Design an enzyme around this catalytic site. Structure first.
Site, PDB file in Angstrom:
ATOM      1  CE  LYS A 149     -18.563 -98.962   9.134  1.00  0.00           C
ATOM      2  NZ  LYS A 149     -19.332-100.017   9.848  1.00  0.00           N
ATOM      3  CB  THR A 150     -12.693-101.046   5.734  1.00  0.00           C
ATOM      4  OG1 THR A 150     -12.887-100.157   6.841  1.00  0.00           O
ATOM      5  CG2 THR A 150     -11.289-100.861   5.175  1.00  0.00           C
ATOM      6  CG  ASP A 170      -9.488 -96.470   6.632  1.00  0.00           C
ATOM      7  OD1 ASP A 170      -8.564 -95.649   6.459  1.00  0.00           O
ATOM      8  OD2 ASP A 170      -9.321 -97.583   7.173  1.00  0.00           O
ATOM      9  CG  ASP A 171     -11.331 -96.781  11.466  1.00  0.00           C
ATOM     10  OD1 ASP A 171     -12.135 -96.719  12.419  1.00  0.00           O
ATOM     11  OD2 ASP A 171     -10.945 -97.860  10.970  1.00  0.00           O
ATOM     12  CE  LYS A 215     -15.937 -74.629   2.243  1.00  0.00           C
ATOM     13  NZ  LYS A 215     -17.309 -74.798   1.689  1.00  0.00           N
ATOM     14  CE  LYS A 267     -13.306-107.430  12.152  1.00  0.00           C
ATOM     15  NZ  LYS A 267     -12.868-106.037  12.448  1.00  0.00           N
TER      16      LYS A 267
HETATM   17  N1  LIG Z   1     -25.431 -65.442 -10.004  1.00  0.00           N
HETATM   18  C1  LIG Z   1     -24.449 -66.164  -9.456  1.00  0.00           C
HETATM   19  N2  LIG Z   1     -23.966 -65.785  -8.252  1.00  0.00           N
HETATM   20  C2  LIG Z   1     -22.984 -66.501  -7.699  1.00  0.00           C
HETATM   21  N3  LIG Z   1     -22.374 -67.590  -8.171  1.00  0.00           N
HETATM   22  C3  LIG Z   1     -22.870 -67.943  -9.362  1.00  0.00           C
HETATM   23  C4  LIG Z   1     -23.882 -67.303 -10.059  1.00  0.00           C
HETATM   24  N4  LIG Z   1     -24.134 -67.950 -11.261  1.00  0.00           N
HETATM   25  C5  LIG Z   1     -23.285 -68.947 -11.260  1.00  0.00           C
HETATM   26  N5  LIG Z   1     -22.488 -69.004 -10.147  1.00  0.00           N
HETATM   27  C6  LIG Z   1     -21.456 -69.996  -9.862  1.00  0.00           C
HETATM   28  O1  LIG Z   1     -21.866 -70.690  -8.702  1.00  0.00           O
HETATM   29  C7  LIG Z   1     -20.724 -71.010  -7.875  1.00  0.00           C
HETATM   30  C8  LIG Z   1     -20.888 -70.240  -6.593  1.00  0.00           C
HETATM   31  O2  LIG Z   1     -20.240 -70.972  -5.531  1.00  0.00           O
HETATM   32  P1  LIG Z   1     -19.456 -70.229  -4.379  1.00  0.00           P
HETATM   33  O3  LIG Z   1     -18.121 -70.828  -4.174  1.00  0.00           O
HETATM   34  O4  LIG Z   1     -19.449 -68.733  -4.684  1.00  0.00           O
HETATM   35  O5  LIG Z   1     -20.390 -70.443  -3.107  1.00  0.00           O
HETATM   36  P2  LIG Z   1     -20.329 -70.107  -1.553  1.00  0.00           P
HETATM   37  O6  LIG Z   1     -21.734 -69.691  -1.121  1.00  0.00           O
HETATM   38  O7  LIG Z   1     -19.246 -69.151  -1.243  1.00  0.00           O
HETATM   39  O8  LIG Z   1     -20.042 -71.537  -0.923  1.00  0.00           O
HETATM   40  P3  LIG Z   1     -20.028 -72.268   0.499  1.00  0.00           P
HETATM   41  O9  LIG Z   1     -20.997 -71.625   1.431  1.00  0.00           O
HETATM   42  O10 LIG Z   1     -20.358 -73.728   0.183  1.00  0.00           O
HETATM   43  O11 LIG Z   1     -18.572 -72.174   0.964  1.00  0.00           O
HETATM   44  C9  LIG Z   1     -19.523 -70.494  -8.664  1.00  0.00           C
HETATM   45  O12 LIG Z   1     -19.211 -71.510  -9.607  1.00  0.00           O
HETATM   46  C10 LIG Z   1     -20.135 -69.351  -9.466  1.00  0.00           C
HETATM   47  O13 LIG Z   1     -19.400 -69.282 -10.679  1.00  0.00           O
HETATM   48  N1  LIG Z   2     -20.028-109.473   1.608  1.00  0.00           N
HETATM   49  C1  LIG Z   2     -19.050-108.948   2.354  1.00  0.00           C
HETATM   50  N2  LIG Z   2     -18.997-107.604   2.490  1.00  0.00           N
HETATM   51  C2  LIG Z   2     -18.024-107.073   3.235  1.00  0.00           C
HETATM   52  N3  LIG Z   2     -17.047-107.693   3.900  1.00  0.00           N
HETATM   53  C3  LIG Z   2     -17.123-109.018   3.749  1.00  0.00           C
HETATM   54  C4  LIG Z   2     -18.069-109.713   3.012  1.00  0.00           C
HETATM   55  N4  LIG Z   2     -17.838-111.079   3.081  1.00  0.00           N
HETATM   56  C5  LIG Z   2     -16.778-111.176   3.845  1.00  0.00           C
HETATM   57  N5  LIG Z   2     -16.291-109.973   4.284  1.00  0.00           N
HETATM   58  C6  LIG Z   2     -15.129-109.769   5.144  1.00  0.00           C
HETATM   59  O1  LIG Z   2     -15.605-109.229   6.360  1.00  0.00           O
HETATM   60  C7  LIG Z   2     -14.684-108.237   6.870  1.00  0.00           C
HETATM   61  C8  LIG Z   2     -15.405-106.914   6.815  1.00  0.00           C
HETATM   62  O2  LIG Z   2     -14.442-105.842   6.749  1.00  0.00           O
HETATM   63  P1  LIG Z   2     -14.000-105.052   8.043  1.00  0.00           P
HETATM   64  O3  LIG Z   2     -13.458-105.960   9.073  1.00  0.00           O
HETATM   65  O4  LIG Z   2     -13.052-103.934   7.617  1.00  0.00           O
HETATM   66  O5  LIG Z   2     -15.353-104.360   8.519  1.00  0.00           O
HETATM   67  P2  LIG Z   2     -15.776-102.989   9.209  1.00  0.00           P
HETATM   68  O6  LIG Z   2     -17.289-103.030   9.406  1.00  0.00           O
HETATM   69  O7  LIG Z   2     -15.253-101.823   8.473  1.00  0.00           O
HETATM   70  O8  LIG Z   2     -15.105-103.125  10.644  1.00  0.00           O
HETATM   71  P3  LIG Z   2     -15.026-102.339  12.038  1.00  0.00           P
HETATM   72  O9  LIG Z   2     -16.360-102.641  12.728  1.00  0.00           O
HETATM   73  O10 LIG Z   2     -13.897-103.033  12.805  1.00  0.00           O
HETATM   74  O11 LIG Z   2     -14.787-100.886  11.808  1.00  0.00           O
HETATM   75  C9  LIG Z   2     -13.512-108.270   5.894  1.00  0.00           C
HETATM   76  O12 LIG Z   2     -12.707-109.372   6.293  1.00  0.00           O
HETATM   77  C10 LIG Z   2     -14.189-108.703   4.596  1.00  0.00           C
HETATM   78  O13 LIG Z   2     -13.214-109.435   3.871  1.00  0.00           O
END
Ligand SMILES: Nc1ncnc2c1ncn2[C@@H]1O[C@H](COP(=O)(O)OP(=O)(O)OP(=O)(O)O)[C@@H](O)[C@H]1O
Ligand SMILES: Nc1ncnc2c1ncn2[C@@H]1O[C@H](COP(=O)(O)OP(=O)(O)OP(=O)(O)O)[C@@H](O)[C@H]1O
Ligand SMILES: Nc1ncnc2c1ncn2[C@@H]1O[C@H](COP(=O)(O)OP(=O)(O)OP(=O)(O)O)[C@@H](O)[C@H]1O
Ligand SMILES: Nc1ncnc2c1ncn2[C@@H]1O[C@H](COP(=O)(O)OP(=O)(O)OP(=O)(O)O)[C@@H](O)[C@H]1O
Lengths: 16, 513, 534
Positions: free
Chosen positions: C343-344, C397-398, C425, C502
């Site tokens: 993944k990394t 990562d991690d 957020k 790996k």
């Molecule tokens: N009728 C509406 N009421 C509220 N927000 C609206 C409306 N129409 C458009 N929007 C837009 O939608 C977004 C609302 O997101 P908001 O941050 O208010 O959500 P939240 O419910 O507080 O979020 P969360 O629960 O993920 O923290 C804002 O961009 C607001 O401008």
């Molecule tokens: N096709 C491939 N995709 C990803 N990594 C590859 C590939 N071929 C070779 N590798 C090598 O395999 C290793 C995979 O990366 P890495 O060791 O970070 O994996 P990881 O799944 O994130 O590890 P961990 O399980 O330790 O969290 C790296 O050395 C990468 O160079």
């Protein structure tokens, strides 16, 4: 608290 | 008083002429004096001009000026001997001509350097004795200027030695206008200034400026105009053919204001507008109901005599738009004091810091006549995790106490809280503290979704017909923020794939309450 | 005139400073060049000070000495550091006044039509520091500052002097000196760019070209491309090192120094010297902001099957969305899969393929033994740096190692979790865009903490599942011959396998330690023993 540590000094000369 | 070339200090000079020379100009018989002045202020406000013009206006001998710490000497007895050479003529005139003696003016520049250890204390003592000692003089005036008034010796400021203390401050808009007129009159007289330039706009723009900075801005404008007739790279040139005709346009002043000079003071940052980005679009009845309830609560707070404090809680599922509507209600309240408390401004804090910040906000609120405060993301404020569970009790107790403390007599307060987890708050026994609650729902049916898409205007008719075929005959459960996210994700692909991707995502997010 | 009539920009020898010198000339030397009559009509005053500052080795002293050379005037006076201080009381100020005595006398004698006097202060911060905030032990420094302030602009007016000052820490200078009338033009010198690097290299290679002592295989454009974050001093040191390497071929030592002579007339500098010095002699003082991608990707990436491509495609799509969107200036994604899947490396590749100005990776490898407050401070600093750029990308990562998770009890740090939620957020300042990529190996735990909903999308990274993929991976690696591959296929092709790449590399390395007649059996035994999985 901890008491401020010891410190060095500078000196100034004067003619007569 | 603009003749001397300093603007914005006319009133200070009126005070000067009253307190300094009234006795000298007043007829002698009725009189039958002051010998100390200290000017202080931030740099570049015209103290040197004041001293020079004061020296020039009076009909007296040429003033004596000492430039900084020239008195100090390496040998013994020379530093003090240097002071006694200043008053020899004054003593001679006092002893010979008696009362009918000319005025003597002494100017001390950077006087904090010599007044404030054998040399310095002796110098100060000699000066103090000479100014006010056994022999009393009535024909001497001593002027000092400082930029750091808090580093001067106290004993020098007592009555009889340094009496007239004066402060020079940053000029206001009229003073700045006077300064600009003074520094632009020479250009205007010779018709070297363009007709497009307006001094009033410049005066309004140059906020927090001092006189020196204004003159520097003017100089920068001149340099910008002048360089047009200068050639470099190979050799320095003057042009002459076009240099003879030099006009200072408005663009030169604007460019000089952008970079060359700066106010050198702080700036203010605003965050309220950030809480409503996309605005409020009416896609159904519930928004109107919520706004009407908010108006009712606001009016109740305004016109209540024995219920000065009112609280409300906004309920809804995630991604439903709760903070936006609370901000809208607060804005429509039209109260002198409005503020928003958010956890975004407190990252990495401990419990005590959060408590102090909340207390500071509420303390500021208590000072006004009628105030409104909104707190959002309560579960984030008292950080809560379902595992264990774990939370901060100090903040919970602080909120519980603050939710039922009335402001001082005769003042009004409104509080609006938002959350998306009501069962947790009910378990904590805080839902009782509030006075009432409101519910913010999601989009339920397909007609409301189609209306919202119509308002947004992202899809045309051909795709809306297919969407209506698909959704109209079914119930839906989706927020608006997530709806916009989905629309933006779908728009990325080519026009052929957009509808199918959008409906696939919608089907992925489908659910029921 | 005030300008030496024999002058040119080219003979000065300044590489990367084009805008700065033009601004200096415009804002400091226009008044003294034009005819006196128009200046008198305008009635303006001349500038009297300049303040240069910047990081070490960028060209302040070179600029100052070239400016001194450019003018026709008296020889400039130089103050080398704190050479004014004396032990007898009242003698420093006398030294200061001796500097301005000559200019004062000349001005008094000749009026407004006198010559110009130049005074240069180097390491000005040594002598000029805030009067109030200093060691309250001796009052010499404050008196020196007061004397300088009074002498530059006092009651008596001196208007035929120009004072230049250079430093490394501008902030310490007292404010009363940095105001219009004393020192208003304050320039900043910084590290050059590719064009400036090319100009500097061309400046320093000219004489070698002129006398035909440089090989034709040398390409300055490629050198300017390679030398990233170098400065002028380093760019000159590289050339000096290359010249030394070229010269050392003709000297024989280890008993007596002999310098040949017959072959010393056919010397040239090739590109091998430059390539060798770039890697053995000179290292940039400024730490490379570029991430060390070689550490995270240590064995490259091989397309052993379809999913790899798919994953990359998804990443590309996401990048496009964050680049061409205004309704959603913030985007997030999470990469999850079984351990030892890679993944990394894939996350690092996705981050690298993009061409964003700012790219950083946050890893627990640097926070060893840290408290739960230090981690928050580090994350906050990284995100604060990210906010500045117009387009930013960040990789976390991690995540499970960043929260100190242990399944016994369980135990974890809550402060970091809350900080991470809040950071995920919020949105950057107006008109800026940010992308965040997270990596983890345990998704159910994150679901329990209720943070899986904070992200916008997820991508799955599977491991090897079929024997055909295993054979393709072995072919790409090329560790076994055809004869061994037939035997391996005869067994593996029948059934399915479940192993990460790996772990596959580890198993191959362990197997290759046996004698040739045993390696295949060792590999098969290891695969059968450790391969019990879905
Ligand atoms: N009728 C509406 N009421 C509220 N927000 C609206 C409306 N129409 C458009 N929007 C837009 O939608 C977004 C609302 O997101 P908001 O941050 O208010 O959500 P939240 O419910 O507080 O979020 P969360 O629960 O993920 O923290 C804002 O961009 C607001 O401008
Ligand atoms: N096709 C491939 N995709 C990803 N990594 C590859 C590939 N071929 C070779 N590798 C090598 O395999 C290793 C995979 O990366 P890495 O060791 O970070 O994996 P990881 O799944 O994130 O590890 P961990 O399980 O330790 O969290 C790296 O050395 C990468 O160079
Ligand atoms: N109020 C003002 N009106 C007009 N010109 C002003 C004013 N303030 C400053 N200036 C301009 O600034 C210069 C005068 O500065 P001056 O020496 O009087 O300042 P100061 O307050 O004594 O300075 P410092 O404390 O730094 O020694 C002249 O260029 C004058 O044109
Ligand atoms: N922009 C440049 N163009 C050409 N040569 C340069 C440039 N910058 C530096 N050099 C070379 O590097 C040498 C060292 O730089 P210089 O002495 O000007 O640095 P400095 O900024 O005054 O130093 P510091 O801040 O370390 O005291 C210069 O003499 C010149 O040889």
């Amino acid at each position: 608290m901890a008491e401020d540590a010891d410190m060095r000094n500078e000196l100034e000369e004067m003619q007569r | 008083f603009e003749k001397m070339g300093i603007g914005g200090l006319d009133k200070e000079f009126s005070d000067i002429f009253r307190r300094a020379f009234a006795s000298r100009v007043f007829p002698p018989e009725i009189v039958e004096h002051v010998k100390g002045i200290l000017l202080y202020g931030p740099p570049g406000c015209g103290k040197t001009l004041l001293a020079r013009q004061i020296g020039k206006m009076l009909n007296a001998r040429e003033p004596k000026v000492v430039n900084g710490p020239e008195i100090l000497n390496k040998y013994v007895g020379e530093s003090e001997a240097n002071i006694r050479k200043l008053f020899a003529d004054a003593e001679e005139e006092q002893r010979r001509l008696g009362a009918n003696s000319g005025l003597h003016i002494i100017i001390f520049d950077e006087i904090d350097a010599i007044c404030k250890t054998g040399v310095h204390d002796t110098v100060v003592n000699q000066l103090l004795s000479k100014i006010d000692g056994v022999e009393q003089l009535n024909n001497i005036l001593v002027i000092g200027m400082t930029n750091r008034p808090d580093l001067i010796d106290e004993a020098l400021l007592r009555p009889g030695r340094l009496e007239v203390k004066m402060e020079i401050g940053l000029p206001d808009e009229k003073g700045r206008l006077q300064i600009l007129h003074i520094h632009t009159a020479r250009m205007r007289g010779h018709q070297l200034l363009s007709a497009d330039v307006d001094i009033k706009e410049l005066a309004v723009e140059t906020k927090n400026f001092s006189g020196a900075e204004l003159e520097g801005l003017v100089r920068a404008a001149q340099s910008t105009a002048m360089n047009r007739h200068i050639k470099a790279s190979t050799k320095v040139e003057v042009d002459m053919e076009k240099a003879e005709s030099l006009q200072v346009t408005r663009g030169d002043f604007l460019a000089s204001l952008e970079n060359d000079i700066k106010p050198a003071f702080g700036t203010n940052q605003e965050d309220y507008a950030s809480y409503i980005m996309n605005g409020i679009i009416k896609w159904g009845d519930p928004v109107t109901r919520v706004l009407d309830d908010g108006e009712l609560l606001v009016q109740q707070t305004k016109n209540s005599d024995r219920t000065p404090l009112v609280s409300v809680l906004l309920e809804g599922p995630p991604h439903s738009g709760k903070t936006a509507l609370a901000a809208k209600i607060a804005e429509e309240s039209n109260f002198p004091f409005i503020k928003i408390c958010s956890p975004d401004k407190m990252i990495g804090f401990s419990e005590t810091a959060k408590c102090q910040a909340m207390k500071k906000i509420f303390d500021d609120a208590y000072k006004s006549q009628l105030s409104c405060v909104v707190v959002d993301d309560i579960e984030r404020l008292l950080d809560y995790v379902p595992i264990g569970p774990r939370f901060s009790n100090l903040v919970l107790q602080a909120l519980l106490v603050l939710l039922k403390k009335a402001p001082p007599q005769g003042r009004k307060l409104l509080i609006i809280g938002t959350t998306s987890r009501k069962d947790v708050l009910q378990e904590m026994e805080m839902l009782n503290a509030f006075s009432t609650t409101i519910h913010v729902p999601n989009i339920a049916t397909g007609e409301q979704l189609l209306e919202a898409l119509e308002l947004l205007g992202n899809f045309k008719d051909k795709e809306r017909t297919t969407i209506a075929q698909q959704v109209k005959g079914k119930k839906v459960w989706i927020g608006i923020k997530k709806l916009l996210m989905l629309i933006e994700m779908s728009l990325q692909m080519d026009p052929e794939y957009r509808v199918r991707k959008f409906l696939a995502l919608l089907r992925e997010e489908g659910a029921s309450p």
